[PDB]
Write an enzyme that holds these catalytic residues in place. Structure first.
Site, short mmCIF file in Angstrom:
data_model
loop_
_atom_site.label_atom_id
_atom_site.label_comp_id
_atom_site.label_asym_id
_atom_site.label_seq_id
_atom_site.Cartn_x
_atom_site.Cartn_y
_atom_site.Cartn_z
N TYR C 89 82.97 90.92 35.94
CA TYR C 89 82.82 90.32 34.46
C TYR C 89 84.26 90.24 33.69
O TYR C 89 85.30 90.65 34.38
CB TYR C 89 81.80 91.14 33.49
CG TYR C 89 81.28 90.27 32.46
CD1 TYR C 89 80.83 89.01 32.65
CD2 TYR C 89 80.94 90.87 30.99
CE1 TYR C 89 80.53 88.23 31.60
CE2 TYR C 89 80.63 90.17 30.13
CZ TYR C 89 80.11 88.92 30.22
OH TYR C 89 79.69 88.01 29.23
N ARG C 142 82.61 78.97 24.39
CA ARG C 142 83.39 80.03 23.57
C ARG C 142 83.47 81.21 24.58
O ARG C 142 83.49 82.37 24.29
CB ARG C 142 82.89 80.54 22.13
CG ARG C 142 84.03 81.24 21.38
CD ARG C 142 83.32 82.15 20.45
NE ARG C 142 82.12 82.84 21.01
CZ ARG C 142 81.89 83.88 21.80
NH1 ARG C 142 83.15 84.33 22.08
NH2 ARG C 142 80.88 84.34 22.14
N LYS C 160 77.76 88.28 34.00
CA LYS C 160 76.96 89.15 33.07
C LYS C 160 75.70 89.66 33.75
O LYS C 160 75.35 90.61 33.68
CB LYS C 160 76.77 88.28 31.84
CG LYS C 160 75.70 89.11 30.94
CD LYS C 160 75.87 88.58 29.46
CE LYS C 160 77.03 89.19 28.79
NZ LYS C 160 76.41 90.83 28.61
N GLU C 232 74.75 83.44 25.83
CA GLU C 232 76.17 83.98 26.18
C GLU C 232 77.02 83.07 25.33
O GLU C 232 76.93 82.65 24.23
CB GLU C 232 76.32 83.60 27.69
CG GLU C 232 77.41 84.52 28.15
CD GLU C 232 77.43 85.94 27.69
OE1 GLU C 232 76.37 86.59 27.41
OE2 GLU C 232 78.39 86.51 27.22
N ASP C 233 78.40 82.94 25.89
CA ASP C 233 79.45 82.53 24.94
C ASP C 233 79.10 81.11 24.19
O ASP C 233 79.70 80.01 24.94
CB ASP C 233 80.63 82.46 25.81
CG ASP C 233 80.94 83.77 26.26
OD1 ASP C 233 80.93 84.91 25.77
OD2 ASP C 233 81.15 83.88 27.50
N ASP C 255 73.99 88.57 23.01
CA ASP C 255 74.86 89.93 23.10
C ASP C 255 76.23 89.95 22.50
O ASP C 255 76.88 90.91 22.19
CB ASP C 255 75.10 89.83 24.60
CG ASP C 255 75.92 91.33 25.07
OD1 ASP C 255 75.22 92.46 24.58
OD2 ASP C 255 76.94 91.33 25.40
N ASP C 256 76.86 88.76 22.29
CA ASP C 256 78.19 88.47 21.56
C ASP C 256 77.91 89.11 19.91
O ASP C 256 79.02 89.81 19.50
CB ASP C 256 78.68 87.29 21.54
CG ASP C 256 79.10 86.75 23.05
OD1 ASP C 256 79.77 87.82 23.77
OD2 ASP C 256 79.12 85.72 23.57
N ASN C 345 90.13 92.48 21.07
CA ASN C 345 90.15 92.48 22.43
C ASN C 345 91.47 92.30 23.09
O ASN C 345 91.38 93.20 23.79
CB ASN C 345 89.21 91.16 22.91
CG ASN C 345 87.88 91.21 22.30
OD1 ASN C 345 87.43 90.39 21.40
ND2 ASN C 345 86.91 92.17 22.62
#
Lengths: 506, 506, 506, 506
Positions: C89, C142, C160, C232-233, C255-256, C345
């Site tokens: 990941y 993203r 993931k 996801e993103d 999850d983000d 990050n």
């Protein structure tokens, strides 16, 4: 998927496959060069079927149809279901069971043996379908009228499952017929060289019970706790014991106990639709209190309670007589319209003749039976078409509602409201002829209604596990009702805009 | 491979699967909990089979057996083959063909239509088996006695292929029954609503011929040029034309033309075994010179040549009479032992009654027929069991020898030596009763011998393509003879030394 | 099932197949003649893996392992998960995504395109597994740090999902990675000849939304309403909008959004375990109120409410500052122990250096980050191992609890109690070093606990659909935790008493 | 057939599947939403391939391509075959073999062990393809230059089989790579923990020989006596012994013995095309008479015989010198144009430097080698591109001709005429540069010609078993030449006249 499609009865359409379908499935050439609708296939099957000179031969034709083309099999059944129910299920299925060594074509169902104790999960893996929502299991010990038939009784869960689909619309691929072979006590089968079962006495006690426990555990481990497990012709005491044991642990019911009682209470309420009185205005004398009238009495007490009458006097209204010692007479061994229920099967074991009642009571007596009785030609002119209480009024619709909504357990209230719906099914012109049950040609619709009612109950008592609760339950149940209409096997071909599907030749 | 094994007739053993086999195949539970040998399965099938009151019902039982369990089907056949040949093949197969709309169970074979011209390779791909060594194709146009039956004649290549296996030992999985549907001229089928074929007239001429060319090309492209292609009941002129066209291009033969002629010449040579004379000491009058006696006359001339007599006078010995105008009389429309051959099928179209010959000739007349004739009760005491010339004496053994050795073409010499072997098959005690053909219960052995002889011929004339030429051809043919005995489905488990199979736990 | 077993990554064990297994599976000869345990296979994979000079090469090795032998893949992962999480990941998966045209080995996942609108059910049918309990879908818009990568982002739901199994124990066969390709706005990919996606701009508005609606409908029609669908993103605004749209209609979460907020609140509560004060004794200043601090603030308000503090003043305790304008400082753009959260990050976008905090605050400052920060060598001697808030602390255990109990929707309370469990996970000796999160080598256990807690919640709020409610939820979740240990492919052979399994030779 | 198509390398086209193909195969969604031609796929593979910094990495890329998409693999190979032959086959394949424990991706081929003696037919059943026409078997004992590599030598029959397809056009699905593991005497592998073979010494003598006998018997029992079985890097004495044993019993040859000799004789005849003399005008001194020069001398004597010169003096023309004791000098350990053959592999074991010959002989010396030698920059100006004798000049075309015509045995005359065709392949402008072999970019065409010649021989000596003998053998061989071009997976849909395909709605 080529030649294997013609060997799958759920897929195979025979000559109803179109040329496009045959070419797309890689089966072109395997089928004769004609293209039929299901109507023409039905007419051809009917021509071959009416050439037989026996109900056993008709049964064999229908079972070969079932293992060739099951959409056509259920088209045959759902077309004049009143005609084919006696052949697919009782009475003819019992005689075929008696003659399964002689007439052993392709085997259907799952045979689970007492000697498979510990390995039932693998045996379930042996069944080709993985999405099983209804399991009809039989012991073979109390096949209707025929006694112990062990391992010949496999035609009973098969035939009954056919009625699950024909009368209820339960998907046949989600149905699993099981015979639990623990031996047989029928001495004629232990010596019969054509016998296909275990040739020893029935196992019983702490090995039978552990086999049944592992069977329930394995079925709900593979297919989920929502799998409907119906117990077929078990021995009476054994059947009641297993019902009480598994009733709240699993989604099980016994159609011989609960379905029969529900049909009887349905007939009683339909008769009340004629007597114009309340159930509280009735006192009931039973005649066969041998575990058969017990269910009727319990469900009748429950109905008396639901209409307002508390438990004690509701039980006071029941007078169960058998070998030691009014408004309604019910047998399973004063007033304007007495209610007489024969409810006994072989038309010879019975309480009346449907003409004895109608000619003795001067015709003002509401008769119901479990035996086929032709119409009456009473001298005054009253015709009195007598109704027959079929168990197919209950189990198909209840099973459809239980499978539709994932109902976890089937309490007695389900069967009471099923009886209430069946009572409401009868038309007033049918009640004018003394008919207490709806005609079988309506059973599909009836089943649907029952399912909806059962669904409506299970959601308002938090019994339905299906989520989310459908706002319109009729259309939700209709979306699950299986139809004999063929699916299209042609491939849904579409295209993308001719810039996304452009093949890059960089 | 689980449930699919019970659906494959070549694999499925039914209750003959052992428990170990059922567990290893993942089919345990799908079969009743009994374990039978093939002898018990045969006895059960025979009990069910003898309960039928028709040859059509017996035929349906055998065809259901064939599509359930084909090892058991061929065990039934190869047990009393004389009894089941009339039911699986002619005469009963023709009547079943007449009644295939009514009695349409599972379809078998490949239906290739004139409208599939250009796509026959895909249709061949539709057949599940890929190793096909024998193809019996029919037009349906001249079904024996029954006339045009187009697309009902599919039972003929199926039934005949059964005899390939039952009488010859040809592997049934390497056999492909084909019906070429080009329409039908039978007016009763064009109007029959149960008819499963093309409902237009037969296509003929430059479209029929191109369809046949593409069929031969496609069959030998998929299955190899060594694929044996037998032409079944084509129209007489059409059959002879196709025989001459494809005889040297492919491994084809016509059993109606060449097999019938070979059986007739076999009977003639067996009769010579009684007259004690040479074939050169015989003059032959034929009676039906309508393409049927032509093959007999050609093969008989070939035999006269092979024994030494050059072509011209060998032809001078033949007197073919039909509607315009001794030692041997042959009909297909002076001396101590005259040879009388009826050779006509329906026992009513014939030349004698097998009693007319034996009571008129004073019993010193060698009779043969193609019609079943019961024994004679002649007044002096002579019994005279009359022999019947079955085509099953020729095509099974010839097909076994051709498939065994990969023989590329079947010249007339193959059929002559087949006739010679069949003549040699008859025992002198059978010749004492006037019987010109070996008993059908011997056919397997007879076929074997014929195969070996055919093999022996094909290698010494460079016709056999199988390599290397086996030193012992009897054991080579025996290794290819299919038997109804079940294979073992248990897995061959062995171990390595416990240092090579050590699992490394580094 | 022979050669196909070595091609199924869920089945293939490679040289870990025993000789008995190879013979029973019909794969003997396809594998080299050595027999390895999974430990030896792990050592061999590790040797090949440590020979690579790039994280991209290591990633390619791991993805080839995943598509060869997925039990061995998850054995590699679950062995030193802290080492392989950065490669499988983020961060490495993003760089591989950047380089998927160059490094395109076997494709994994389901690519559903905007031009497939109306046919998503067929595309779901294209996936080989039918029992899918978790779907991670991405837009590709993203991808973390990398921006729009559309149709290269397929490595994100794959990677993931690996963490679903490696960190949580979710069954990998019940996981479905989906990329929804609606085009890309990344100009470098529209011109990239190696680009594997739609080369047009992103579709948006009433076609994007209808594609997502049909995707959710199709996924829950095929796999059931209990299918966990993680987003996801997606783009920030798009992600929040879809979360609010589908949060209560389906079993979806982002999850983000929710996982990040849960990790942040977990760190805050773990820090409270050091400050020894209540959450009500804290005032929170946020620094990045750009939809990222919104989730943290909402979940923190929810925690303040749950500990007793009503909504209004709980919101009064939050001071969210961004570009216009104490006890805890949180950034996503006075007191004894100030709480400083970097949570940014790329280690360059951040608020501190984990040494700036510890050397400026004189070491009495609890630091947490979302960026990897090496230990501190502060002059007094304090070491201060700084903890990193991984999203893998939340989504694996939450997904395991949601899949275990069939939880229908994931409310914010699930994520709050997840944060509470993660806070409780930290040991006091780890808190002595300023570490706010449990070590990743514990994640499996941590996930388990979270699952149980989530389960415990869902049953007491009637959210868990699994029936019946297990009395011991730890052992129920443990029964569903997938392990990299190989199954045995040997067949369970048993026997019957040697009178029931006797083969009848009647 | 859905997801399984993307897992079959013979079927999988990757993103070259069209949308119609993806929808018809049920694989839509499994592939990224782009549609590529094989040219774009080749460009993408080439980009990924040129990013590697090792021949081992390039080899791994090509083997992953082979097990993903073998049409694309052979498109990569047949595009610049001169570039990829060193990587797929020797020299790089030997180094990969040395490093197969480290670099063990998906296994390819069939591993048959000495401990499988008695069960080789089952192991052959383990191979997925049933139509195998070429088997390359290796012992692993004499891997070129690398010595004993047992069970690492599996890359040799794989790589060589790639050249069967890349250089010859042999269908890759009809090729079977086999490694016969009898142990290894390489001490480094017996201790190597990554070693994938039997860790004991080589079995030899009456167990090795019986294993080989059963291997040949099993291969020709399953795949037919026409199966081409090539023996790979066996030990020298063992290889020659097995060649003599199986040469006339089966369709076997040894490319190390017969192919090398054929290439050498091809170079000698091409040099005669420069010396302008006959082979009878040459006397040959050999230098390495260690079983390697034996084949060259035998084939050269055979050529001298075929041009007219009887055996005795043809043998008198050969002077084989090795360690005890003109026109042509050949080494495998006076005149205007002396012929110097180095023929030694590692460029260090050799007889000259291709510059020593050309600068010592004053350039008037025809040099050939088995080692790569760059061009010469001789002082006068002569360039002298020196040719290299590859074994790929012989075995692909010979194998194509043997598989095309079903040639039963490969006598030495096949290899002589192969050498003659290869000699004729060289252009006079290439002979002007001292080049004795055709360029490898022509190998396909060369192979074709050789095949035709071999075919032309086998039919005129009754060696070809294919029937019938094709009138035009070039087009017959071209019909069997495998091409990397993708097939169309779209279904051939046609219709019948709209009266035959009318669905009857009677």
């Amino acid at each position: 998927r080529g030649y294997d499609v013609t060997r799958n009865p759920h897929l195979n359409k025979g000559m109803a496959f179109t040329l496009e379908e045959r070419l797309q499935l890689g089966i072109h050439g395997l089928i004769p060069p004609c293209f039929l609708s299901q109507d023409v296939q039905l007419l051809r099957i009917m021509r071959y079927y009416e050439r037989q000179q026996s109900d056993l031969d008709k049964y064999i034709i229908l079972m070969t149809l079932q293992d060739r083309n099951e959409k056509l099999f259920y088209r045959v059944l759902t077309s004049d279901v009143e005609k084919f129910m006696p052949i697919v299920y009782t009475p003819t299925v019992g005689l075929a069971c008696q003659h399964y060594g002689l007439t052993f074509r392709r085997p259907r169902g799952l045979f689970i043996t007492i000697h498979d104790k510990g390995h039932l999960a693998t045996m379930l893996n042996s069944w080709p379908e993985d999405n099983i929502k209804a399991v009809v299991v039989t012991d073979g010990e109390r096949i209707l009228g025929l006694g112990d038939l062990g391992c010949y009784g496999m035609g009973i869960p098969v035939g009954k499952l056919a009625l699950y689909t024909a009368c209820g619309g339960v998907n046949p691929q989600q149905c699993l017929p099981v015979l639990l072979d623990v031996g047989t006590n029928n001495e004629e089968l232990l010596r019969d060289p054509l016998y296909i079962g275990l040739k020893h006495q029935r196992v019983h006690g702490k090995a039978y019970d552990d086999l049944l426990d592992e069977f329930m555990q394995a079925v709900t481990d593979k297919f989920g706790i929502n799998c409907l497990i119906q117990f077929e012709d078990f021995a009476n005491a054994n059947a009641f014991r297993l019902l009480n044991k598994y009733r709240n642990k699993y989604c099980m019911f016994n159609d011989d106990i609960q379905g029969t009682a529900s049909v009887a209470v349905a007939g009683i309420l339909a008769a009340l639709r004629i007597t114009k009185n309340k159930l509280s205005n009735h006192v009931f004398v039973f005649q066969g209190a041998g575990e058969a009238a017990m269910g009727i009495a319990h469900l009748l007490v429950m109905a008396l309670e639901k209409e307002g009458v508390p438990k004690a006097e509701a039980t006071r209204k029941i007078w169960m007589v058998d070998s030691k010692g009014p408004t309604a007479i019910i047998g399973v061994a004063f007033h304007e319209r007495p209610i007489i229920f024969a409810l006994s099967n072989p038309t010879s074991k019975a309480e009346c003749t449907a003409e004895k009642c109608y000619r003795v009571t001067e015709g003002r007596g509401i008769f119901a039976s479990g035996s086929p009785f032709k119409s009456v030609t009473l001298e005054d002119g009253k015709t009195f078409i007598p109704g027959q209480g079929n168990n197919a009024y209950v189990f198909p619709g209840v099973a459809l509602g239980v499978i539709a909504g994932g109902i976890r357990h089937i309490p007695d209230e389900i069967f009471l409201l099923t009886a209430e719906q069946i009572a409401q099914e009868v038309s007033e012109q049918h009640l004018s002829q003394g008919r207490l049950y709806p005609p079988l040609s309506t059973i599909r619709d009836v089943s649907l209604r029952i399912a909806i009612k059962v669904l409506d109950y299970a959601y308002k008592h938090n019994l339905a596990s299906y989520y989310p609760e459908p706002k319109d339950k009729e259309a939700f149940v209709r979306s699950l009702v299986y139809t004999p209409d063929y699916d299209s096997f042609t491939l849904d071909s579409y295209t993308w805009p001719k810039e996304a599907m452009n093949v890059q030749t960089v």
